[PDB]
Amino acid sequence: MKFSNSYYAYIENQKNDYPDIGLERNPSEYQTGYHRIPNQYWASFLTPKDWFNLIYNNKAFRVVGARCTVSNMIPLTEQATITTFNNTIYALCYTDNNYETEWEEPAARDLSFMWREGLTNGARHMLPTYKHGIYRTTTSQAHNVFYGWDPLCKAENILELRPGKNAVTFEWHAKEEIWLNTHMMQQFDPTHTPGIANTATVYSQEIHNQTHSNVTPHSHLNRWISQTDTAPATARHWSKQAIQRPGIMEQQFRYPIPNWFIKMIPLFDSQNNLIKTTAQVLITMELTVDTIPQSLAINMPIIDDIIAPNHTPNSVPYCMFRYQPIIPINVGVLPAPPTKGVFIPELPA
Amino acid sequence: MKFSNSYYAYIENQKNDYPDIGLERNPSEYQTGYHRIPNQYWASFLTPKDWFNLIYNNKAFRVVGARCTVSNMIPLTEQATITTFNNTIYALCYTDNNYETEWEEPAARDLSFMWREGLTNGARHMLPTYKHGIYRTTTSQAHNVFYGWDPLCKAENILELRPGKNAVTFEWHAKEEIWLNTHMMQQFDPTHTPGIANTATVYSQEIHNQTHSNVTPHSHLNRWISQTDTAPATARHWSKQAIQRPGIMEQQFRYPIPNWFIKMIPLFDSQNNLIKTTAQVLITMELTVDTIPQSLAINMPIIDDIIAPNHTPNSVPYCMFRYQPIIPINVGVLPAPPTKGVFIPELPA
Amino acid sequence: MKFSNSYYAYIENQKNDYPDIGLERNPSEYQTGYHRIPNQYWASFLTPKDWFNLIYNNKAFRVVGARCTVSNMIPLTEQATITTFNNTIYALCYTDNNYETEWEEPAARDLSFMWREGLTNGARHMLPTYKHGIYRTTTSQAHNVFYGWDPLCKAENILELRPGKNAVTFEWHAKEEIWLNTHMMQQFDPTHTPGIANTATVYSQEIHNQTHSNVTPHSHLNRWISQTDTAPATARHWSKQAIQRPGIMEQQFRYPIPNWFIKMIPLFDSQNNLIKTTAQVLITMELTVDTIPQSLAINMPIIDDIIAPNHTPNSVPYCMFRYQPIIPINVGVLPAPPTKGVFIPELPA
Amino acid sequence: MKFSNSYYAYIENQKNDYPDIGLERNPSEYQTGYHRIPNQYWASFLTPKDWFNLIYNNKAFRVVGARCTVSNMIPLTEQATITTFNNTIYALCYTDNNYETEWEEPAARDLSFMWREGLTNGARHMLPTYKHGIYRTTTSQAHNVFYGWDPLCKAENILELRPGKNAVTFEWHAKEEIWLNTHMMQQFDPTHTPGIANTATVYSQEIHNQTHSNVTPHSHLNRWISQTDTAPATARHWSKQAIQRPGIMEQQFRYPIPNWFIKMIPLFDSQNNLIKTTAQVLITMELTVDTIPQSLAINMPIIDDIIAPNHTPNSVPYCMFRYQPIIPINVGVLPAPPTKGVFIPELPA
């Protein structure tokens, strides 16, 4: 099936604070001023009804592609009194298919779909900016200042978004078929069981929450650390939960969704000061997911606990994304990221 | 190549003891009365000569498909005096390709091929019945009583076996190529060896026994537990051998052989009592295995220790299935399930 | 791209010291007298400029095939006075595509490309001979003496190299696409990071050296030991670094480069003594590697630390092969074998 | 099926020591200097794996043809210091299809297939020479000196083998279909039984050994002695085991494999002394055997006791060739030569 969700966001022309000239830092970090379209987690693509349509009555699903269309550019200027006029300026759209930029920082209650007018809970929905860091290896003596990432170095690949009835599209296609079960629990072999020998036990990834889980996990490195790092057993990373529990191999994408960058063109005046030009944009996040319909030999539908909208007075409401918790299917790969699961029945001593 | 083995077994019409109405149990288990055709292990498909033909003079093999034909239905009634007459009744044949039913419990000396007349060691060869369990996740509050598995809910997929010259076929096709070596031992890299550095050592899965080993291992969950469960190090399942040693990844099937269910139609009298109708059936278990012939540069054939028929006076005879123990081939995946292996030469301190 | 390197080496007709007739040894080892063409590591195929052309300006590469042509056979006899005459004799060329022979022992500064005249640092470049070992499993009682490897048992597959303008070619083709990044470092997920939560850290395989690293790693067994061996936790192999850190799964070849065997025909006189016939051969090692060009959005090229030629007075010079150490790409598989890596920034407590 | 085995042997140019001029002997014997290719027994054609492939899973077999290709002639001269040069000389190859030469003397552990390099257990594999004997009948007064066998008398049928890339082929085709069972034991008629009347007993040729048994027995004369010789009962030959037990009539070949003769050309110097020229030759012994596959109605394969490799410390290893010892088939001819058999059950008084 295919999900499409539109909302309004704001972008600016913050200048690229090019790599620091001062004292050298091994992870040399700087602000690029480029806004990053949120395209990593499920909540960045799906409303709760989209998630329910995805999980309900389907036994497996796989992500086929993602797409974002930025359109209806309405530029705004403030005389620091808010003029809605600009014609010549444009936005810079760049897709990092080189995967040389840092992954998106986790969003804290993005919830851009409950407030689609551009004012999320009484605050302007300004897109998050990207802060780039330059990491050289420890042994090398290269100066990081020379290796600053800049899409203008690949300006032949930069698309521009003019104001008005114009649209710039970001596109991603899955180059691998990663089918995920919609059920959070599977059976063990009676001969190869963690419970009572020659008896049936079930492991279940508990209900948890999938709004902030990556649509493309791509956590391959975590599994590789335990395979390639020859540090002694007293090393710090061996006790880290990320290294210990990397995530299912058949669940991570080799070519995940890249970072999508958009930015108003920065302009400077005679006093070497950036003149600020904000713009409203209609962001249409679209996700394509292939599904296999579910045909279980039962009378009931598996509908409860899939979504749980939580709201308390004066607190920001939110709805959790969850999988089917009722019946285990013993074929397919568990979909949820590494989280504390349970065993049914509980293991003995 | 292709293996076919026929034998006679018996089935009944035990009623489906639908989910318990009484006190709720998280693994709500009940008897479905459905007989399960043994189709999981090697001994369910292969006689010792079939196993020897499979392993001898082949360097690799892969399971292509499995098939079971149930025919020559001879129904019997007992006046609790054994009438061999029934014409209208029929059997219910259902294949669980949804993989929502528990895996087959291990067979204790099934040995249905040494006694093919229907009387295994002076006991009627009645097929094993399936006891279904309903596992919901711990957190959910769903009542398991409503989620009882029943093929009559998918009665459009139920095939029927009439008595007489009739046949119902169960079919399974491998959707993945899982090639397994016929040799139980391989070499290490001299640069990446567990023994003496820059020296040759060999790991060998010992002779063991493969009669009860799954033809399609499908033990994927065991490897996933160590990748997704974020329980603390003191958790019970971390010390379980099943979790610690899951089995070779390249050895497990993603779409293994499903459970095949057959059942006489249950009938009830005025006193609400099941009237018992037993039937003899000719079961023809068939397995297709692709093989690559072996062309080693040696003078001897690797024939010993492949099968070891054990018989002691007054004890039930049995023959063990084993792989080629003589020469290691350093390419391909070891075939045997996780079992205590040896190193040649033994590792130093 | 495609790399070709020619050099001169020497081969002899050392007789096959067939399996020992004396006291039995479980790893029964003997000298076969067959010379083994060095074809396992990068330095066996690539000069430093070839390695730099491979790594520089490429973001990924995969090994497509390897080839060795042995030609210009000039046989020599010594009257133990060095006659360069022989016409009827020939060499025996055999490829072990059965993978039943031990892997090549690590070469100690092979460096056959700096001295291509046949005299490496004032020593004749005689090809290394193969010592074959017969490993049976511990439990079996088979005599290893009967299972000696000998290509004359497959003499229908032996190619012969006549002296003069003649050539015998060894060929290997990769049957799997194993793409490797040219960068030694990748980013972590902020949500699934070993460092500060919701913050960016990088794992980096340090610079190390890749001259002696396998062009086809094929270290699958090491990862399988932790999946199939059910020995108790106090077993010797559980603390071995090879078992603990097997290497990246997506990095090992299922069908690596086999051993290539060449040997002068052995001849014996009336006193049952081998008459020694040495021959000079022109060895042309050729490797085909597919590459994807690198198009990073940076101004600098990543050129330093890729190769570091080390020379000290009166010590044999050597050049190290290394990957790109400057910029991490978060897609693809790390290329280097298991070696002590670093984290940027360093992990906290 | 078809068996091919290659190995290296040595031949010389020993002069034909033409019939003795001295005192006359009725069996006038002399050395012809012609090397005889071993082509009479099973071990001259089959490795143990070839024998196992022949006997296992086959109920009958017949010898179709035999072939020997002598090639890769490398001549050697010793200055009684071992020169590998000769171009003009050649070998003389002659096939005795007249069957006028003595049959091959039994080989004492020929075992040329375990050591195929030309040095069998630290001794040069020189081919056995043929010593011809001239037998006239007792009554006749012909001088045997005039009837010396010499292929130069039929030099139009002599093939020559030049050194280098040249090959001379010996060929034999069976002109009769002699099918032999692979089972060493058969049933008797209850009406015509040596045991209890109207009861079942089995005669079994015991396991014994078939490495030195003729591939073509051709022992017709032994059976004819008891049919044509009218000597009195006190004659010496009536108590000989060869006459008493000739061998199965349906087992002997009327046109067996003839003697194959090869010889370096003899050359003489001014002092009437033979100048010795030894040559290495690649002997490729090939045997074609038709087989009928075995389809017994049993579960086990008949694999044990077929071959028994015997090795003791410091003693030359050897493997015995044997037939199927488990199940008697009551049709076909027993394959083994006359040897002490057993009866099951044992005969009463």
Numbering used by the authors:
A (entry chain A), B (entry chain A), C (entry chain A), D (entry chain A): 1 to 80, 88 to 356
Paper text:
Particles purified from the mixed SsChPV-VP-BAC+SsChPV-SP-BAC suspension were vitrified and imaged to resolve their 3D capsid structure using cryo-EM. In spite of the low particle count, we obtained the SsChPV capsid structure at a resolution of 2.93 Å. The SsChPV capsid structure also displays the canonical eight-stranded jelly roll core and long linking loops that are typical of the Parvoviridae. All other PV capsid structures have a disordered N-terminus, but SsChPV is ordered from the first residue, which is the translation start site of the VP ORF. Compared to other PV capsids, SsChPV lacks N-terminal elements such as the βA strand; Met1 is part of the βΒ strand. In PV structures, the twofold symmetry axis is typically supported by direct interactions between the β-strands of the jelly roll core, but SsChPV’s β-sheets are too far apart to interact. The extensive gap at the SsChPV twofold axis is occupied by the bulky sidechains of aromatic and large hydrophobic residues, which create an expansive hydrophobic interface. The threefold symmetry axis in the SsChPV capsid creates an hourglass-shaped invagination; the pore present in homologous capsids is closed in this capsid only around Met256 and varies in diameter from 5 Å–13 Å above and below that site. The wall of this opening comprises three α-helices, donated by the GH4 subloop of each subunit. In SsChPV, however, the ascending and descending stems of the DE loop comprise flexible coils instead of β-strands, which prevent the formation of a similarly long, more rigid channel wall.
Chapparvoviruses (ChPVs) comprise a divergent lineage of the Parvoviridae ssDNA virus family and evolved to infect vertebrate animals independently from the Parvovirinae subfamily. Here, we report the first structural analysis of a ChPV, represented by the fish pathogen, Syngnathus scovelli chapparvovirus (SsChPV). SsChPV is a pathogen of the gulf pipefish (Syngnathus scovelli) and is a member of the exclusively fish-infecting ChPV genus, the Ichthamaparvovirus. The SsChPV capsid exhibits T = 1 icosahedral symmetry and is assembled from 60 copies of a single VP.
